[PDB]
Amino acid sequence: MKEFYLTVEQIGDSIFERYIDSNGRERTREVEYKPSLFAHCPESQATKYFDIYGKPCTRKLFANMRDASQWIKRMEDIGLEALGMDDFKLAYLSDTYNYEIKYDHTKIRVANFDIEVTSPDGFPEPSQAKHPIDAITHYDSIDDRFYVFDLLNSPYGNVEEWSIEIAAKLQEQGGDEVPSEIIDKIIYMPFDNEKELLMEYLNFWQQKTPVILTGWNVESFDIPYVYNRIKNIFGESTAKRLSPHRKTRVKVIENMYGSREIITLFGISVLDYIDLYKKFSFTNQPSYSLDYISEFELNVGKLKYDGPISKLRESNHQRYISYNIIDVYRVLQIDAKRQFINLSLDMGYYAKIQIQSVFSPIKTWDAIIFNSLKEQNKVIPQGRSHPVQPYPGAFVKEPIPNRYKYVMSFDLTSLYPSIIRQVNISPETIAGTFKVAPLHDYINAVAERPSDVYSCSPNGMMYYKDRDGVVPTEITKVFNQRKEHKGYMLAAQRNGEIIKEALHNPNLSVDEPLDVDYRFDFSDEIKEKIKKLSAKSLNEMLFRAQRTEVAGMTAQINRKLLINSLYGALGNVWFRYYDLRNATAITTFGQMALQWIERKVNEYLNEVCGTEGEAFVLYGDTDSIYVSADKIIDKVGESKFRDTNHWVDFLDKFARERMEPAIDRGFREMCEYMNNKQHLMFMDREAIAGPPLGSKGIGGFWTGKKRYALNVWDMEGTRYAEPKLKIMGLETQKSSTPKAVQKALKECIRRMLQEGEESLQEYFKEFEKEFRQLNYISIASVSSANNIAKYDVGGFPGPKCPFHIRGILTYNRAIKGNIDAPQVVEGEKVYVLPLREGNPFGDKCIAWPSGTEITDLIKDDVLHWMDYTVLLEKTFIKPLEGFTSAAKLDYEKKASLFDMFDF
DNA sequence: GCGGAACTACT
DNA sequence: AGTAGTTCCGCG
Ligand SMILES: Nc1nc2c(ncn2[C@@H]2O[C@H](COP(=O)(O)OP(=O)(O)O)[C@@H](O)[C@H]2O)c(=O)[nH]1
Ligand SMILES: [Ca+2]
Ligand SMILES: [Ca+2]
Ligand SMILES: [Ca+2]
Ligand SMILES: [Ca+2]
Ligand SMILES: [Ca+2]
Ligand SMILES: [Ca+2]
Ligand SMILES: [Ca+2]
Ligand SMILES: [Ca+2]
Ligand SMILES: [Ca+2]
Numbered sequence: 001m002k003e004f005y006l007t008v009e010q011i012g013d014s015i016f017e018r019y020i021d022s023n024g025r026e027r028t029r030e031v032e033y034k035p036s037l038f039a040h041c042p043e044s045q046a047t048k049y050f051d052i053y054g055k056p057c058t059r060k061l062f063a064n065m066r067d068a069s070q071w072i073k074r075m076e077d078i079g080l081e082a083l084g085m086d087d088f089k090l091a092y093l094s095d096t097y098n099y100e101i102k103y104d105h106t107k108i109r110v111a112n113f114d115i116e117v118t119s120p121d122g123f124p125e126p127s128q129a130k131h132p133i134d135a136i137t138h139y140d141s142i143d144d145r146f147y148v149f150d151l152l153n154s155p156y157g158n159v160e161e162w163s164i165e166i167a168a169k170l171q172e173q174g175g176d177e178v179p180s181e182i183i184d185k186i187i188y189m190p191f192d193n194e195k196e197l198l199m200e201y202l203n204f205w206q207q208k209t210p211v212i213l214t215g216w217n218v219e220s221f222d223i224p225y226v227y228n229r230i231k232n233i234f235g236e237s238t239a240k241r242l243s244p245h246r247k248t249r250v251k252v253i254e255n256m257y258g259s260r261e262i263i264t265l266f267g268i269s270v271l272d273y274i275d276l277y278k279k280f281s282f283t284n285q286p287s288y289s290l291d292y293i294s295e296f297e298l299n300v301g302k303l304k305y306d307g308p309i310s311k312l313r314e315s316n317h318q319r320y321i322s323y324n325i326i327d328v329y330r331v332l333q334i335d336a337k338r339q340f341i342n343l344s345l346d347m348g349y350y351a352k353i354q355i356q357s358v359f360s361p362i363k364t365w366d367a368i369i370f371n372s373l374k375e376q377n378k379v380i381p382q383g384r385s386h387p388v389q390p391y392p393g394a395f396v397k398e399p400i401p402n403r404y405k406y407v408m409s410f411d412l413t414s415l416y417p418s419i420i421r422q423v424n425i426s427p428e429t430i431a432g433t434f435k436v437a438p439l440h441d442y443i444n445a446v447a448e449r450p451s452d453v454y455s456c457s458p459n460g461m462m463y464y465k466d467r468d469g470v471v472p473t474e475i476t477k478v479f480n481q482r483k484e485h486k487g488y489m490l491a492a493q494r495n496g497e498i499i500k501e502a503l504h505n506p507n508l509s510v511d512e513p514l515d516v517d518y519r520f521d522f523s524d525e526i527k528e529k530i531k532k533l534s535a536k537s538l539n540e541m542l543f544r545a546q547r548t549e550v551a552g553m554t555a556q557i558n559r560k561l562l563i564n565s566l567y568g569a570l571g572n573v574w575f576r577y578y579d580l581r582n583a584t585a586i587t588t589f590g591q592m593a594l595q596w597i598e599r600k601v602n603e604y605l606n607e608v609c610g611t612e613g614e615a616f617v618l619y620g621d622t623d624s625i626y627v628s629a630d631k632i633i634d635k636v637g638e639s640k641f642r643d644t645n646h647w648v649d650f651l652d653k654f655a656r657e658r659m660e661p662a663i664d665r666g667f668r669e670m671c672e673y674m675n676n677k678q679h680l681m682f683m684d685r686e687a688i689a690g691p692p693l694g695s696k697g698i699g700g701f702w703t704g705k706k707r708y709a710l711n712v713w714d715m716e717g718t719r720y721a722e723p724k725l726k727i728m729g730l731e732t733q734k735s736s737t738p739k740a741v742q743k744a745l746k747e748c749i750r751r752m753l754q755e756g757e758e759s760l761q762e763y764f765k766e767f768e769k770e771f772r773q774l775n776y777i778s779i780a781s782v783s784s785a786n787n788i789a790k791y792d793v794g795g796f797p798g799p800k801c802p803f804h805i806r807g808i809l810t811y812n813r814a815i816k817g818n819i820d821a822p823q824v825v826e827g828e829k830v831y832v833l834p835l836r837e838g839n840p841f842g843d844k845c846i847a848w849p850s851g852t853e854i855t856d857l858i859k860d861d862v863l864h865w866m867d868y869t870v871l872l873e874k875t876f877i878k879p880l881e882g883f884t885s886a887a888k889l890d891y892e893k894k895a896s897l898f899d900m901f902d903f
Numbered sequence: 904g905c906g907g908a909a910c911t912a913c914t
Numbered sequence: 915a916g917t918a919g920t921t922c923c924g925c926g
Contacts, residue, residue, distance in 0.1 A: 117926055124926060131926085220904070221925035253904045258922075260904045274924065275905095284908095288924060309926060736910085783922095800911080802921070827926095 004103045005096075006211040008089045008354055009245065009266050013064040015092050016245050018211065018267060020107050028244070033092050035068045036061045037084040038379045039075070048377045052428045052470050057083055057379050083379045085370055093352045094371050101349040110141040110341060111210030114328050115222050116320070118156050118313050122786060122827020126221050127252070127261040129229035132156070132194050134313060135321055136201065136226075137328045140208055146186045146328065147204065150321055151197050157314035161190045162321040171304070176322035182329055198230055202241055209244045212269045212341060212355060216290045216331055219272035224261040243267055257787055269355040273331055276340045279359065280561070286735045294330045297337055308828070308851030339554065347558045361565040362575055368562075369474055369577070381427070383576040391584040394622030395591040396705050397598075401886035404618060405699040406629040406690040407710060408651055410663065412593075412683035415623040416567040417475045419589050424455050424677040426469025427579050436460040439588070443595040445673060455676045457585035458592045465677050471570070471577065475563065482559040488519035489552035495522050496545045499530060499538060506535035513540040518548035593670065593681060594620055600666035601627060601659075608658070609635055619702060625683075629654075629690075644693030648713045655685040688714040692723070696756025701887040703730070709883070711753040725750055730883065737875045738779040740771070748880055748891070757889045764880075764891040771876070772868050779871060780831045782850065785824060797843075807832045807847030814841060814858055821857055822849040834867035841865070 006018040006026065015033045020026060038049060038057040046056030062068040065088050075082040085091040116135035117124050124131045134151035150162055168183050169175025191197035215222055227248070231239035240248050244267035253260050264270075274288055285293060291302045303323055305312060313320045335341055347364065348355040352371060357363040370380050412418070419425070431454050437447035442458045454462035463469070495518050511534050516526055530538070569575040571583045598617045605616040609631045619626040629651055641647045660683075667681040689710040691697030700710040707729040713720060725746070732745045744767045751759045783804045791801045797809055808824050815821045824830060829850040835841055840861050848854050854862060877891075884891050 115926090119926055122926095126925080215925095217924045225925085255904060255922090256920085258904065262904085290924085312926090734909090787921095800920075802911090 001104070002099070002102055004101050004349065005093065006108065007267050007269060008093055009247075010065065010089050011245060011247055011266065013066055015089065016267060017092075017096075018244065020104070024104075024107055026107070026109075031092070032064060033088060034062060035065055035088050035091060037068060037071065037082055037086075039083065040081060049379055050377065051083055051379045051381060052373070052426075054428075082382045084382070085374075085380060086383070087366075090353060090367050090370065094374055097352060101352070103345065103349050105342065105345060108141075108345070109208065109211045110214065111208075111212070112139040112141075112214045112328055112331055113137060113218065113222065114215050114324060114331075115226065116313075116324055117225065118154070119310055119827075120156070121825070123784075124225070125259070126224035127228060127259060129225055129232055133198070133226070133229060134194075135324050136197075137324045138201075138204070139328050139332065140210075142208070144185060146182065146325055148186060148188045148321065148325060149197055149201055150188065150190050151194055152190055153192050154194070159314070159317040162188060163318060164188065166318060167322045176319050176326075177303075178322050178326060179329065182325070186325065195233060198233065202230070205242060206244075210268055212271055212344075213265075214271055214273045214276075214331065214335070214341065216327070217272060217274045219262060219270055219275060220260055223265070223270070224263050227263045228261070271341060271344055271356060271358075273335065273340070275359065276344070277334070277338070280338070280340050280343060286733050290327060290330060294334065297334050298330070300330070308849070310828075310851075339550075343554055343557060343561075346554050347562065350558060361568045362572060364562070365566060365569045366576055368478075369470065372474055372477070373470070381576060383574075386573045386578065386580065388573050389580070391580065392587050392591065394587070395594050395620060396622065397617075397620035398705060399619040399702040399708075401701075401703050403698040403701045403887045403889075404628050404630075406633050406651070407618070407626055407687075407700055408629055408655060408685060408689070409621075409624055409626045409687045410655075410659070410683050410685045411621075411624045412597075412681055414563060415590055415593075416586060417479075417563050418680045418682075419586050419593075420469075420566075420570075421472045421475055422455075422671065422676045422678055422680040423457055423585065423589060423674070424463045424465065424469050424472055425457070425461075425582050425585055426463075426471040427577050427582065429463040429467065429469040430461065430579075430581070431464045432462040433460050434462060439592060442592050443599060449673060449675070451675055453675075456674045457589045458674075459581070459585050459588040461581055461585040463677075465675070471566075475566065478559050478563055482556045485552045485555040485559070487552075489549055489556065491521050492518040492545055492549040492552060496542065496549060498522060498527060499542045499545055502530045502533065503535065503538050503542070505531070506538060507532050509534050511537050513537040513544070516541075518545045519552065589674075590622070593667075594623070594625065596670050597663060597666055597681075597683060598625055601625065601663065604659075604662040604666075605632070619708070624686075641693055644690075644713070645719070647690070647693065648688050648719070651688055652714060659685060684716075686716045687712055687726075689726070692754055695754065696758065697754040698752055698756070698887060698889075700753060701883065703882050703886040709749050709753060723754065725753070731879060734875070736781070738774075738871070740774065740778065741876045744771075745876065745879060749883065752883065752887060752889065760884075760889060761891055761893060767876075768872075771872055776833060776863060776866055777831065780833050782829065782831065784827065784829045785847075786827050788824070788826060803845060804830060804832050804847055806843060807845045810835075810841050810843040810846040811848050811858075814846075815855065818855075818857065821855045822852040824849055833862065834870050835862075836865045836867045836870075839865035 001022065003022045004020050006020060009016045013032055015031045017029050017031070018026070019029065037060050039060060040055055041058045043056060045058060047058065049057045049059060051057060060071070062071065068088070072082045072086065114137055115133050117131050117133050119131050132151070132154050134154055136149045138147045138149070139145070140147065148162070152159060152161065164183060164186060166174060167176045167178040168180060171177050189200070191200070227239055227242060240246050243265045247266035249264045249266070251262050251264070277293065278288065285296065294300055295302065303326060305316070305319055305323065307315050344355055344358050347358050351364045351367040353363055353367045373380055434450040434456065436459065439458055441447040450456040451462055455465045456462050514526060514529060516522065567586070570578060570586070572578060598620060602616055605627070606612055606614050611631070614631070616627050617625050618628050632651070632654065633647065663683050667683065668679055671679045671681070687710070689712045690699045691711060697711065700708060702708040709730060710726040712724045712726050727749065730749070732749070733742055747763060748760055751763055785805060785808045788805050788808055791798045791805045792809060795809065795813060797806045808830060811824060824847070830847045831850050832845060832847045834845050835843065837844070846862060880891060
C-alpha cells in the first residue's frame with residue numbers, strides 16, 4: 001500500500017531514513033536533503049508565503065543543511081528573524097509523506113530484550129561493564145520467537161546447558177513453570193565463550209535490526225551495558241554496529257555518588273517500557289519493579305527462588321535462564337494489555353516525528369502545528385528563548401477540615417484547552433491591554449467591563465474576536481477528530497457482534513471474506529451475505545472487524561492525550577509559540593471561572609433551600625467544585641427515602657434538572673462580562689457520595705487540600721452495585737508501610753464512611769493485637785547498602801548515616817569473629833527492623849542479609865527486642881489520627897463499661 | 904541520572 | 915514543625 005517510515009535521522013548533510021516499501025519490504029535510504037527557510041520581505045515582494053501575523057516572506061532554498069544552519073547563525077547577528085522549521089528531519093518527513101499516514105504495525109520490527117550479569121561485588125555499573133554477560137534473551141515480533149543466548153564457561157563458573165523439557169513442569173517437581181504457549185516459540189543457543197556469544201549476538205542484530213527497542217529499564221542499564229561491554233572487548237567502532245548507520249552518541253550523568261550513561265543509537269527508536277509505563281499509566285504505583293507492576297496488571301506472583309541473587313547462576317542455572325525468558329514474556333503481556341507501544345506509533349505517525357519524540361509534548365505539538373500551517377503556505381515563527389519564571393497556578397480552595405455527609409461534585413470539560421478556545425488566546429491574536437482590577441473584583445462582578453470589542457481575561461490581555469487563532473483552530477481540529485474515531489470504533493465494535501451471531505450458524509461450504517469497510521455499519525446486502533458465509537471467511541472478518549475497532553480506539557486515546565498535553569507546551573519557555581502573558585491569561589481565567597461558578601452555586605442553593613450566607617461549596621479542584629447536599633436532603637426529611645439507592649436517584653435528578661441549568665446560565669453571564677468569542681465552559685455533575693441509608697457512616701471527610709475520602713455511589717451516570725471508596729492523598733499505600741497496615745488503614749476509612757465511629761473503634765482494637773502477632777520478616781523493610789564503607793566510622797554509624805546503614809553496622813558488630821554468619825556486602829540487599837530501647841545490640845535498629853535467614857547468633861534477641869509499638873504508632877496510628885481528628889472522631893474510647901463496677 | 908517523590912535534620 | 919538539606923528509585 002502507501003509506504004511509511006520506520007526511522008528518520010540527520011547525519012550531517014544527508015538524511016538517513018528506514019521505511020516500508022509500497023510492496024511491503026523494509027528499505028533504507030540516504031538523501032542529501034535541501035532545506036528551505038524564510039525571511040521577512042517588503043509588501044511588494046510578497047508572494048504566497050505569510051507568517052501567522054500576516055507579514056509576507058520569501059523562500060530561501062539551500063544547497064545542503066550545513067549551509068542552512070550556517071545561514072541562521074549569520075541571520076542572528078544581522079538581527080533579522082529566521083522563520084521556518086529548523087529541525088530538518090521534520091521538514092523532510094512533511095515533504096516525503098504529504099498525506100495521512102496509514103501504517104501496518106505487522107511490518108514494524110519491535111524488539112524486547114533483557115540480560116543477566118553475575119556480580120560478586122556490587123550491582124554492575126553499565127558505564128564500566130566489568131562483569132561478563134552470561135545470558136540474554138531477545139524476542140523479535142516479526143518472527144514471534146524468543147532467542148536465548150546462554151553462556152557456559154565464565155570466570156565465575158562453568159555449567160550445564162538449559163533444558164526446555166524440564167522448564168515447563170510444575171515447580172513442585174523441579175520445573176520452572178515456563179508458560180505452555182511459549183515453549184514452542186523458543187530458540188536456545190548455548191555458547192562456550194563470551195566473545196564468541198557476543199559476536200553472534202551482533203550478526204543476529206544486523207540480520208534483524210530492531211526498529212523499536214523495549215524491555216524493562218533497558219535504557220539506563222541493558223543497552224549501555226551491552227554497548228560498553230562489547231566496546232571494552234572489541235572497540236567502540238565495532239560496538240557502534242548496534243546502530244544500523246554506525247553512528248551513536250554517548251551522554252553521561254552523575255550526582256554525588258550515582259552515575260549513568262545513555263547511549264542513543266542512530267537509526268533505531270528506543271521506547272523503554274518502564275519509561276513508557278510511567279507516562280501513560282496515569283496511576284501512581286508505589287513501586288515500579290517488573291515484579292510489582294506485573295502483579296498489579298497480571299495478578300501473577302513474584303517467581304520464587306532461594307539463595308543470594310549474585311550466585312543464583314552457579315547455584316542453579318536451569319532456573320536462572322528460565323526466569324530470564326519468563327521476564328521478557330511478562331513485559332509482552334503488559335504491552336498486550338496496556339498497548340502502549342501501539343499508542344506510541346499512532347501518535348508518532350500522526351505528528352510525523354521520530355517515534356521516541358513522543359516523550360516530548362514540545363516536539364509532538366510543534367510538528368502538528370507546523371504541518372497544519374505548511375499546507376497553507378504559512379511560515380512558522382522562529383523559536384526565541386525567554387527567562388523561566390512562574391505565574392499564578394491552579395486555584396485550590398482551602399477546605400475546612402471536617403466530615404461531610406452528602407456530597408456531589410461537578411467537573412468542567414477540558415478546562416484549559418477550552419479556555420484557549422473561548423477567549424481565543426494565541427500569539428497572533430493579542431490586541432491590547434486594559435487597566436486591571438483585583439481578581440476578587442471580577443469573580444463578584446464589581447469591576448468594570450474591560451471591553452466591548454475584544455475578548456478578555458482577568459489578567460489584562462485582550463484578543464481579537466474577528467479572527468480565529470492558530471492554536472485554538474488546531475485544538476478544535478483535534479477535538480472533532482475524536483468524534484470521528486469514536487464513530488468508527490462503535491461501528492466496528494457493532495459490526496463485530498453481527499459477525500459473531502452469524503458464526504453460531506456457519507455454512508458448510510467454501511467462500512471468501514467480504515470486501516467491506518468496518519468503520520461503517522454493514523448494509524442489509526452485506527448482512528444478508530454474512531449469514532451464508534463459511535466459518536473460515538467469517539472468523540477472518542471477525543479478526544479484521546476486531547482490528548478496526550482497536551485502531552479507532554487507540555486513535556482517540558491519542559487525540560485525547562494530545563489535547564491534555566497542550567497546556568504543558570504553551571507554558572514551557574522552549575515551545576515555539578510560548579508567550580508568558582498568554583500562559584498567565586489562561587491560568588488567571590481558569591481561577592476566576594472556578595470562583596465565579598462557586599459564588600453562583602452558593603447563590604442558587606441558598607435561594608432554593610431558602611436560607612442566607614450558607615456555604616454549599618466545601619472545596620474546589622482546579623476544574624471541580626464539591627457541594628454538600630446536606631440541606632438539600634434535610635429539605636426532604638431523609639425518612640421519606642426507601643433504600644439508599646433512592647436518594648442517590650433523587651440527587652441525580654436535582655443536579656441535572658436544576659443544578660446544571662443554573663450553572664450553565666452563570667457561565668454565560670461570565671462569557672459576556674469578559675466578552676468572549678464562543679461560550680465553552682461546560683460543567684456537568686460527575687460524582688454522588690454519602691453513607692448507606694439508615695447507617696451511622698459519615699459519608700466522607702477532608703483533612704486539607706487534596707486530602708479526602710468519599711464513599712461514591714454514582715460516577716457520571718453509572719450506578720455502582722457496591723459503593724466505591726475514593727482516596728486522595730491520605731498516603732494509605734506508602735512503600736514504607738507493611739502491606740498489612742495498608743489494608744488496615746483502608747479498612748478504617750471504609751468503616752468511618754460506611755459504618756461509623758463505633759464500628760471504627762471495634763476494628764482498631766482488632767488490628768491492634770493481630771498486628772503484634774505477625775511474623776517479623778512480615779513487617780520488616782527492604783533497601784540496599786551501596787555506600788556503607790564510607791558511612792562506617794571505626795565500626796559505628798558516621799555522621800548523617802542512613803537508617804539501614806545503622807542496622808548494617810549494628811549487625812556487623814554482633815557477628816565479629818564468626819565465619820558461618822551471612823555477611824552483608826557492598827551493594828547487596830537487606831532487611832531492617834526497629835529495635836526496642838534497652839536491647840543487647842546497642843542501637844535503635846538492626847539489619848541482615850536478605851538472601852539467607854537470620855543467624856541463630858542473633859535471631860532470638862532480634863525477635864524479642866523487635867519494636868512493634870514504634871512501628872504500630874509510626875505507620876498506623878499517626879496517619880489514622882489525621883483522619884479521625886479532622887473527621888471529629890475517636891479510634892478509642894477513654895471511658896468504658898468497667899467503670900460501672902465500683903472496683 | 905532524569906525528575907522528584909519522599910525521607911532526615913535544624914534554626 | 916515549615917523550610918531546608920540528602921538519598922534514590924529500576925537494572926544483577
Ligand atoms: N510553509 C513552510 N515551509 C517551511 C517552513 N520551514 C521550512 N519550510 C520548507 O518550505 C518548503 C515548502 O514549500 P512548498 O510547499 O514545497 O512550496 P510550493 O509547493 O512550490 O508552493 C519545504 O522545503 C519545507 O521544509 C515553514 O515554517 N513554513
Ligand atoms: Ca533485567
Ligand atoms: Ca533478571
Ligand atoms: Ca529511563
Ligand atoms: Ca449462517
Ligand atoms: Ca477533576
Ligand atoms: Ca461573548
Ligand atoms: Ca463529565
Ligand atoms: Ca538537625
Ligand atoms: Ca551533602
